[PDB]
Amino acid sequence: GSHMEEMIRSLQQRPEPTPEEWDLIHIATEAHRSTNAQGSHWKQRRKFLPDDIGQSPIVSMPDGDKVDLEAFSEFTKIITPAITRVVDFAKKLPMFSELPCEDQIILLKGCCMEIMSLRAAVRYDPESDTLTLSGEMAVKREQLKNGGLGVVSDAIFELGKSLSAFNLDDTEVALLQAVLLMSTDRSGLLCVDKIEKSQEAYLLAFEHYVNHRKHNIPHFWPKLLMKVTDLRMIGACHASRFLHMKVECPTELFPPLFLEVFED
Numbered sequence: 001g002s003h004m005e006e007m008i009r010s011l012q013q014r015p016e017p018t019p020e021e022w023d024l025i026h027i028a029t030e031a032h033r034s035t036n037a038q039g040s041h042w043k044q045r046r047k048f049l050p051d052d053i054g055q056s057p058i059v060s061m062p063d064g065d066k067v068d069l070e071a072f073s074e075f076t077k078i079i080t081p082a083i084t085r086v087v088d089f090a091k092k093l094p095m096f097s098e099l100p101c102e103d104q105i106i107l108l109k110g111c112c113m114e115i116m117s118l119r120a121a122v123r124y125d126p127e128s129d130t131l132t133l134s135g136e137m138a139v140k141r142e143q144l145k146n147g148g149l150g151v152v153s154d155a156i157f158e159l160g161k162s163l164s165a166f167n168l169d170d171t172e173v174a175l176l177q178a179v180l181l182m183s184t185d186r187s188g189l190l191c192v193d194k195i196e197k198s199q200e201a202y203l204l205a206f207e208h209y210v211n212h213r214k215h216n217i218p219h220f221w222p223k224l225l226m227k228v229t230d231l232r233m234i235g236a237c238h239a240s241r242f243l244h245m246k247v248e249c250p251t252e253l254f255p256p257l258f259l260e261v262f263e264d
């Protein structure tokens with residue numbers, strides 16, 4: 001192109017975001033930052049879930065990983081704000097908020113656990129080997145496992161540990177969320193084509209933003225896509241396990257919003 005353009009683009013050749021993609025990137029990034037509990041100040045003012053909690057699984061589950069009701073209660077007491085923040089994030093993306101209300105509900109139920117799991121995973125702390133839930137509650141593998149998640153907890157920790165080396169920034173987390181949200185692998189959607197077109201726009205903007213960032217680890221983009229796949233598997237194991245939870249435990253132990261999201 002122009003001399004200046006060429007000068008500016010010398011150390012690049014992989015496609016950068018277009019100006020339209022930068023707009024999309026900026027809105028998603030801000031939507032995430034404004035809905036992500038604690039402004040990058042999470043590790044300072046976080047508290048550990050007491051070591052004596054989450055050591056006593058005694059409610060049976062079909063897969064044999066039992067549940068500690070006390071730990072389950074501690075986790076579910078803070079889950080309502082966590083789900084609400086995912087909803088707030090989604091409502092801030094124009095391509096989501098212009099969908100029929102019914103499609104918005106289906107998309108949210110479809111991705112809620114995928115996004116929450118990703119938000120917990122990016123707060124993995126290698127030193128203490130904990131996840132920080134909602135940026136306030138540091139939990140150990142055993143505690144999160146026994147408090148209801150079973151093997152889903154091991155999957156989240158594994159993801160969190162592997163994501164450490166990716167050094168994701170807010171934009172990359174935000175775009176993963178948008179890609180998870182705008183999925184047509186749900187049933188009963190009306191605006192299938194429009195949702196797909198939106199996902200494709202986010203995916204391309206995401207690939208181009210990845211080029212822009214020039215991460216030091218190789219094969220970054222396909223590596224990141226593989227993490228999207230892991231997150232969707234985490235979502236599915238959670239949906240399966242939630243069904244069993246509901247068979248074993250009375251409704252009064254589940255906050256209303258938690259039941260609503262993970263319904264069918």
Ligand SMILES: O=C(O)Cc1cc(I)c(Oc2ccc(O)c(I)c2)c(I)c1
Pocket residue numbers: 037072075076078079082116117119120132133134135147148149156
């Ligand atoms: O980290 C925050 O932003 C969000 C965060 C908050 C919660 I509480 C959550 O922990 C869960 C999730 C599902 C579940 O059935 C049980 I029992 C515990 C996840 I993992 C992530």
